[PDB]
Motif scaffolding. Structure first.
Motif, PDB file in Angstrom:
ATOM      1  N   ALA A   1       0.833  -1.234   0.000  1.00 40.08           N
ATOM      2  CA  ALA A   1       0.000   0.000   0.000  1.00 40.08           C
ATOM      3  C   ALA A   1       0.859   1.273   0.000  1.00 40.08           C
ATOM      4  CB  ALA A   1      -0.969   0.027   1.209  1.00 40.08           C
TER       5      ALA A   1
ATOM      6  N   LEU B   1      -0.453   4.824  -1.226  1.00 35.74           N
ATOM      7  CA  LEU B   1      -0.437   5.792  -0.118  1.00 35.74           C
ATOM      8  C   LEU B   1       0.294   7.101  -0.489  1.00 35.74           C
ATOM      9  CD1 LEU B   1      -1.012   6.750   2.799  1.00 35.74           C
ATOM     10  CD2 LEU B   1       0.932   5.366   3.562  1.00 35.74           C
TER      11      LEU B   1
ATOM     12  N   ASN C   1      -1.691   9.131  -2.908  1.00 36.36           N
ATOM     13  CA  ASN C   1      -2.847   9.738  -2.201  1.00 36.36           C
ATOM     14  C   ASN C   1      -2.458  10.903  -1.268  1.00 36.36           C
ATOM     15  OD1 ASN C   1      -4.291   7.706  -3.567  1.00 36.36           O
ATOM     16  ND2 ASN C   1      -4.790   6.552  -1.728  1.00 36.36           N
TER      17      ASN C   1
ATOM     18  N   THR D   1       7.021   7.929   4.281  1.00 36.18           N
ATOM     19  CA  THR D   1       6.469   7.153   3.149  1.00 36.18           C
ATOM     20  C   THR D   1       7.348   7.241   1.884  1.00 36.18           C
ATOM     21  OG1 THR D   1       4.215   7.658   3.986  1.00 36.18           O
ATOM     22  CG2 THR D   1       4.363   6.550   1.846  1.00 36.18           C
TER      23      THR D   1
ATOM     24  N   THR E   1      -4.306   5.215   3.769  1.00 37.33           N
ATOM     25  CA  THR E   1      -4.457   5.178   2.298  1.00 37.33           C
ATOM     26  C   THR E   1      -5.856   5.665   1.885  1.00 37.33           C
ATOM     27  OG1 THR E   1      -2.830   3.426   2.203  1.00 37.33           O
ATOM     28  CG2 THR E   1      -4.194   3.773   0.213  1.00 37.33           C
TER      29      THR E   1
END
Lengths: 151, 152
Positions: A16, A20, A23, B18, B142
């Motif tokens: 993900a 992610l 997004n 991330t 998410t």
């Protein structure tokens, strides 16, 4: 095979990461455009908020972004009157940049909106769950970095 | 600074990780894939065909969320390497359908076994409750950002 359920689950989380990141960027852009700036411009404003007077190379290192990209964005935010360049009497070619009062107001507004939204999200979880997320997120970053350097 | 500031500062730091995480995943994965003679992009296509034998290139593109140009480049590389084959589509001739060869099958199996063994090594450092929390929050984030992007 006893670990299979857990690694299947962790693999799904790891997978993900790519959607992610896409997004996050798209959600961030929604907030930045309300203040008249792009996601890339926001990154530079945040960088200069953290280190007033940084050079373009220093910003590039701190943001882990290529010179070309930093250069383009600096020009955009400077043209928009959000940063200014001051003289560097020690090393003239090492241009140093500061937020202007407007640039400061914009990045302040953006950050307050983002944290308010993260607070909304966080209300759905215990602090224990969120702390576990942070710990694992950082540990995975480390773990894959080490594999990439070593395996 | 209100009462949530510590928690949102911490979550923000996690969110910020991330991008370097995705970079590091890709670099770590590549170490494993090159041991079996393939790239990360090639692995993604082999994995896709493992999951859906007989997929078309547009179907792979949709499943992997990759551009047709990228899928086309990679399909040629793995086919040239003898890792996938194309079979005729007698319903819609234009819709080329692809399958792993036994070699392609051996390679993606080997890559996956190695990746999962490394994930198990990592997981040994945490309780299953911590890892489950990570998964739950990862997927919830998410969704959360997807919704902001669509609605805010």
């Amino acid at each position: 095979n006893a670990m299979t359920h857990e690694t299947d689950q962790l693999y799904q989380a790891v997978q993900a990461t790519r959607p992610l990141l896409r997004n996050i960027t798209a959600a961030v852009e929604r907030g930045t455009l309300r203040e008249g700036v792009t996601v890339g411009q926001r990154a530079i404003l945040e960088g200069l908020s953290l280190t007033p007077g940084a050079t373009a190379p220093q910003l590039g290192a701190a943001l882990q972004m290529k010179r070309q990209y930093i250069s383009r964005i600096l020009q955009e935010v400077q043209r928009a009157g959000l940063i200014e360049r001051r003289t560097n009497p020690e090393h003239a070619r090492s241009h140093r940049y500061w937020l202007t009062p407007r640039g400061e107001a914009i990045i302040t507004a953006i950050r307050a909106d983002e944290m308010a939204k993260l607070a909304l999200f966080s209300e759905g979880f215990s602090s224990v769950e969120l702390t576990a997320y942070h710990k694992v997120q950082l540990a995975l970053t480390r773990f894959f970095a080490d594999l990439a350097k070593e395996a």
